[PDB]
Short mmCIF file of C-alpha atoms and ligand atoms in Angstrom, two decimals:
data_model
loop_
_atom_site.label_atom_id
_atom_site.label_comp_id
_atom_site.label_asym_id
_atom_site.label_seq_id
_atom_site.Cartn_x
_atom_site.Cartn_y
_atom_site.Cartn_z
CA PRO A 812 27.52 74.52 -0.68
CA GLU A 813 24.93 72.40 -2.46
CA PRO A 814 23.91 73.64 -5.93
CA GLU A 815 20.33 74.44 -4.88
CA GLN A 816 21.56 76.47 -1.90
CA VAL A 817 23.75 78.55 -4.23
CA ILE A 818 20.71 79.46 -6.32
CA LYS A 819 18.62 80.34 -3.28
CA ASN A 820 21.48 82.27 -1.65
CA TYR A 821 21.70 84.71 -4.59
CA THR A 822 18.02 85.04 -5.61
CA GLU A 823 14.90 86.62 -4.15
CA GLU A 824 11.86 84.58 -5.14
CA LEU A 825 9.01 86.30 -6.98
CA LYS A 826 5.51 85.67 -5.66
CA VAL A 827 3.87 86.29 -9.06
CA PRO A 828 5.95 85.69 -12.23
CA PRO A 829 6.26 88.60 -14.69
CA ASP A 830 5.37 88.22 -18.36
CA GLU A 831 8.93 88.61 -19.70
CA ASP A 832 11.01 85.70 -20.95
CA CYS A 833 13.61 83.76 -19.05
CA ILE A 834 16.57 84.30 -21.35
CA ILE A 835 18.20 81.04 -20.27
CA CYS A 836 15.42 78.87 -21.77
CA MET A 837 13.50 81.54 -23.79
CA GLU A 838 10.11 80.56 -22.31
CA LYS A 839 7.85 82.99 -20.46
CA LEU A 840 8.61 83.22 -16.75
CA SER A 841 4.97 82.35 -16.05
CA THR A 842 5.35 78.96 -17.75
CA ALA A 843 7.43 75.98 -16.68
CA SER A 844 11.22 76.15 -16.98
CA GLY A 845 12.28 75.19 -20.48
CA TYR A 846 14.93 72.88 -19.03
CA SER A 847 12.44 71.13 -16.73
CA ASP A 848 12.59 68.11 -19.04
CA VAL A 849 16.28 67.34 -18.36
CA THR A 850 16.92 68.96 -14.95
CA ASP A 851 15.83 67.36 -11.66
CA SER A 852 16.07 68.92 -8.20
CA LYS A 853 14.86 68.63 -4.60
CA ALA A 854 13.72 72.09 -3.44
CA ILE A 855 13.34 73.94 -6.76
CA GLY A 856 10.29 73.26 -8.91
CA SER A 857 9.80 73.97 -12.59
CA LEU A 858 7.62 77.01 -11.83
CA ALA A 859 9.88 78.77 -9.32
CA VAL A 860 11.07 82.25 -10.36
CA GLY A 861 13.35 84.79 -8.71
CA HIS A 862 15.58 87.74 -9.45
CA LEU A 863 19.27 87.99 -8.66
CA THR A 864 19.89 90.19 -5.63
CA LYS A 865 22.21 92.76 -7.21
CA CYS A 866 21.08 93.27 -10.82
CA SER A 867 17.37 92.35 -10.50
CA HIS A 868 17.36 90.18 -13.64
CA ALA A 869 14.78 87.38 -13.35
CA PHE A 870 14.86 83.67 -14.33
CA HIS A 871 13.33 80.31 -13.57
CA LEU A 872 15.28 79.15 -10.56
CA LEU A 873 15.56 75.74 -12.21
CA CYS A 874 17.24 77.33 -15.24
CA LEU A 875 19.76 79.04 -12.96
CA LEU A 876 20.40 75.66 -11.33
CA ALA A 877 20.93 73.98 -14.70
CA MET A 878 23.26 76.79 -15.77
CA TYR A 879 25.26 76.51 -12.54
CA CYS A 880 25.53 72.72 -12.90
CA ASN A 881 26.94 73.06 -16.43
CA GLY A 882 29.91 75.07 -15.12
CA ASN A 883 32.24 74.27 -12.27
CA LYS A 884 30.41 74.35 -8.97
CA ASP A 885 32.45 76.67 -6.79
CA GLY A 886 29.58 78.45 -5.05
CA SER A 887 29.67 81.48 -7.34
CA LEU A 888 27.05 82.46 -9.90
CA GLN A 889 27.20 84.75 -12.93
CA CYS A 890 24.12 86.46 -14.37
CA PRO A 891 23.73 85.27 -17.99
CA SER A 892 22.33 88.64 -19.09
CA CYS A 893 24.56 91.28 -17.46
CA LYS A 894 27.52 89.09 -16.31
CA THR A 895 27.46 90.38 -12.72
CA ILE A 896 29.28 87.89 -10.50
CA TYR A 897 27.84 86.60 -7.21
CA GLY A 898 30.49 85.31 -4.84
CA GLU A 899 34.09 84.71 -5.87
CA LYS A 900 34.47 83.27 -9.36
CA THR A 901 37.19 80.61 -9.63
CA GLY A 902 38.23 78.19 -12.36
CA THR A 903 39.65 74.76 -13.21
CA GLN A 904 43.36 75.57 -13.58
CA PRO A 905 45.46 72.45 -12.77
CA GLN A 906 48.31 72.49 -10.29
CA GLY A 907 51.49 74.23 -11.41
CA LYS A 908 53.69 77.17 -10.59
CA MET A 909 53.99 80.84 -11.46
CA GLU A 910 57.36 82.59 -11.22
CA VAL A 911 58.04 86.31 -11.63
CA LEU A 912 61.30 87.86 -12.82
CA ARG A 913 62.31 91.39 -13.73
CA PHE A 914 64.96 92.90 -15.91
CA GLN A 915 66.04 96.35 -16.97
CA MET A 916 65.82 95.92 -20.75
CA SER A 917 62.80 97.64 -22.34
CA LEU A 918 59.96 96.09 -24.31
CA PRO A 919 59.30 97.52 -27.79
CA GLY A 920 56.95 100.46 -27.29
CA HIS A 921 57.84 100.88 -23.58
CA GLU A 922 61.29 102.49 -23.75
CA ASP A 923 60.81 104.32 -20.44
CA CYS A 924 60.78 101.26 -18.16
CA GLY A 925 62.06 97.75 -17.59
CA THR A 926 60.21 94.48 -18.08
CA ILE A 927 58.34 91.91 -15.98
CA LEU A 928 58.71 88.26 -17.00
CA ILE A 929 56.02 85.80 -15.83
CA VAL A 930 56.82 82.09 -16.22
CA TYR A 931 53.96 79.56 -15.89
CA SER A 932 54.82 75.88 -15.48
CA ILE A 933 51.99 73.34 -15.52
CA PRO A 934 52.72 69.59 -15.73
CA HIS A 935 50.49 66.90 -17.13
CA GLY A 936 48.24 64.97 -14.77
CA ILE A 937 44.89 63.38 -14.01
CA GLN A 938 41.68 65.36 -14.45
CA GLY A 939 39.83 66.21 -11.26
CA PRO A 940 36.10 66.32 -10.53
CA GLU A 941 35.71 69.78 -12.12
CA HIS A 942 37.29 68.83 -15.47
CA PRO A 943 35.85 67.50 -18.77
CA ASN A 944 36.67 63.81 -18.05
CA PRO A 945 37.41 63.20 -14.35
CA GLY A 946 39.95 60.46 -13.70
CA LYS A 947 41.35 60.57 -17.26
CA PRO A 948 44.78 61.99 -18.19
CA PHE A 949 45.25 65.50 -19.45
CA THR A 950 48.31 66.75 -21.36
CA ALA A 951 50.17 70.05 -21.01
CA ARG A 952 51.99 71.30 -24.13
CA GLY A 953 54.62 74.00 -24.39
CA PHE A 954 55.44 74.68 -20.72
CA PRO A 955 57.21 76.69 -19.28
CA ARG A 956 55.21 79.49 -20.95
CA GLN A 957 56.93 82.88 -20.68
CA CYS A 958 54.93 86.13 -20.67
CA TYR A 959 56.02 89.77 -20.66
CA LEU A 960 54.70 93.00 -19.14
CA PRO A 961 56.20 96.50 -19.08
CA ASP A 962 57.47 97.29 -15.58
CA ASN A 963 55.59 100.59 -15.22
CA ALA A 964 52.66 101.55 -12.98
CA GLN A 965 50.00 99.88 -15.11
CA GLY A 966 52.07 96.76 -15.78
CA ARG A 967 52.72 96.30 -12.08
CA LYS A 968 48.98 96.57 -11.41
CA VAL A 969 48.32 93.91 -14.04
CA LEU A 970 50.98 91.75 -12.38
CA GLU A 971 49.21 91.98 -9.02
CA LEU A 972 45.85 91.14 -10.59
CA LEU A 973 47.37 88.20 -12.46
CA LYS A 974 48.57 86.86 -9.11
CA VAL A 975 44.96 87.00 -7.90
CA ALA A 976 43.66 85.29 -11.04
CA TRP A 977 46.32 82.60 -10.56
CA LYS A 978 45.22 82.14 -6.94
CA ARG A 979 41.62 81.88 -8.14
CA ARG A 980 42.69 79.20 -10.69
CA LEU A 981 41.54 81.40 -13.61
CA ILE A 982 44.58 81.67 -15.92
CA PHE A 983 44.52 78.18 -17.52
CA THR A 984 41.87 75.50 -17.92
CA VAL A 985 41.61 71.98 -19.35
CA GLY A 986 39.94 71.92 -22.74
CA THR A 987 40.61 71.59 -26.46
CA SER A 988 43.42 73.53 -28.11
CA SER A 989 42.13 76.07 -30.62
CA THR A 990 45.55 75.78 -32.26
CA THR A 991 45.83 71.98 -32.55
CA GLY A 992 42.35 70.61 -31.81
CA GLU A 993 43.79 68.30 -29.14
CA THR A 994 41.25 67.57 -26.41
CA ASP A 995 41.82 67.32 -22.65
CA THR A 996 44.88 69.55 -22.66
CA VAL A 997 45.90 72.65 -20.71
CA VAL A 998 44.90 75.83 -22.58
CA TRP A 999 44.65 79.55 -21.87
CA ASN A 1000 41.38 80.63 -20.19
CA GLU A 1001 40.16 84.04 -21.44
CA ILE A 1002 43.03 86.18 -20.01
CA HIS A 1003 45.34 86.86 -22.94
CA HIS A 1004 49.10 87.07 -22.36
CA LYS A 1005 51.98 88.34 -24.51
CA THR A 1006 54.41 85.47 -25.07
CA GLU A 1007 56.74 87.35 -27.46
CA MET A 1008 58.81 90.45 -26.81
CA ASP A 1009 58.89 91.05 -30.57
CA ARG A 1010 55.67 90.76 -32.58
CA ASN A 1011 57.64 90.06 -35.79
CA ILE A 1012 58.28 86.43 -34.74
CA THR A 1013 54.67 85.19 -34.78
CA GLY A 1014 52.65 88.34 -35.49
CA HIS A 1015 51.70 88.76 -31.81
CA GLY A 1016 53.68 90.55 -29.09
CA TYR A 1017 55.02 94.07 -28.65
CA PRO A 1018 54.56 96.83 -29.48
CA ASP A 1019 50.82 96.71 -28.74
CA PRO A 1020 49.53 100.04 -27.41
CA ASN A 1021 46.17 98.62 -26.26
CA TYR A 1022 47.37 95.49 -24.51
CA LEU A 1023 47.31 96.69 -20.90
CA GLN A 1024 43.83 98.17 -21.31
CA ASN A 1025 42.60 94.93 -22.87
CA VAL A 1026 44.05 92.55 -20.30
CA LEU A 1027 42.64 94.69 -17.50
CA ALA A 1028 39.21 94.33 -19.12
CA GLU A 1029 39.64 90.56 -19.37
CA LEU A 1030 40.63 90.31 -15.72
CA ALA A 1031 37.60 92.41 -14.77
CA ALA A 1032 35.27 90.18 -16.80
CA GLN A 1033 36.44 87.31 -14.56
CA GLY A 1034 35.77 89.23 -11.35
CA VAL A 1035 39.40 90.23 -10.74
CA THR A 1036 39.09 93.99 -10.25
CA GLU A 1037 41.25 96.70 -8.68
CA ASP A 1038 39.43 96.24 -5.34
ZN1 LIG B 1586 14.02 79.51 -17.82
ZN1 LIG B 1587 21.99 90.53 -14.31
#
């Protein structure tokens, strides 16, 4: 869908604008969109105002359009105030593969069950239209990347949700490495994984009693919920 149709699809226009601020541009809703000076459109003027259809938060429609055009344009929208997701949120994960293995040995802190191994393999390539620099190379460092879950009821639920996030292209993105500063490289995208069975190697791994709770919250923040 066209960007302006996304905004209209998920908003109900307000006849008279309230006094409160648009928190995207921090101008009153009754005045022109604060991003009217750098955002052009066809069917959305600088005065148009609406509220999202599920959380009733209100914005200049032209600010919502500018927000949407700064992200990847997959037809989904996320409310900047309450983070409610409209449509199916997807991401810019490059092509690769995701392999799942299991073994009977226990992770530290999960002596009562076996272990799930997830192996992600993403090669280098050419950036697509959704990426920072379309048509330019991107690198991919340190693949295959191996990740571990306990093979209990909660870990198996995380596994199934990770498969959804993978299908929605949400696990990796192309950006700059927080570790090395390198730009235009494949990096993790907001869903943290355990890459060490033993946290003594790097400081991060198992045991970690809060990990499954925390990764479930990260999946949910990206619209990947138990439903
Ligand atoms: Zn605004
Ligand atoms: Zn909202």
